[PDB]
């Protein structure tokens, strides 16, 4: 019904790396499948009337899966590492 909310900081971070990397994906030859993963995911947390805080708060989303939903709670885990920890 013609919404169209007000500009402000969520999660236009996120969907900043979905939407490049997903360029990467049709950019490229054999990556159709893993392209729509960021393409739906980047649409729903890029206009999401609301936050989250977990991979399962992306998951829930319509359009996103386990794979995408996955990099989500990296995200909000802790964001880089280079070793695991034991």
């Not at 500009?7 to 893993?34: P, R, W, Y």
């Not at 890029?46 to 992306?58: L, R």
């Not at 319509?62 to 909000?76: H, N, Q, S, W, Y």
Request: no cysteine; charged share 30%; net charge positive.
């Amino acid at each position: 019904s013609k919404r169209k909310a007000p500009q402000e900081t969520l999660n236009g971070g996120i969907t900043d790396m979905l939407v490049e990397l997903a360029n990467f994906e049709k950019n490229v030859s054999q990556a159709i499948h893993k392209y729509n993963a960021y393409r739906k995911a980047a649409s729903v947390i890029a206009k999401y009337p609301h936050k989250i805080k977990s991979g399962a708060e992306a998951k829930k989303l319509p359009g996103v899966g386990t794979k995408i939903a996955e990099k989500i709670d990296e995200f909000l885990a802790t964001g880089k590492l280079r070793k695991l920890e034991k």
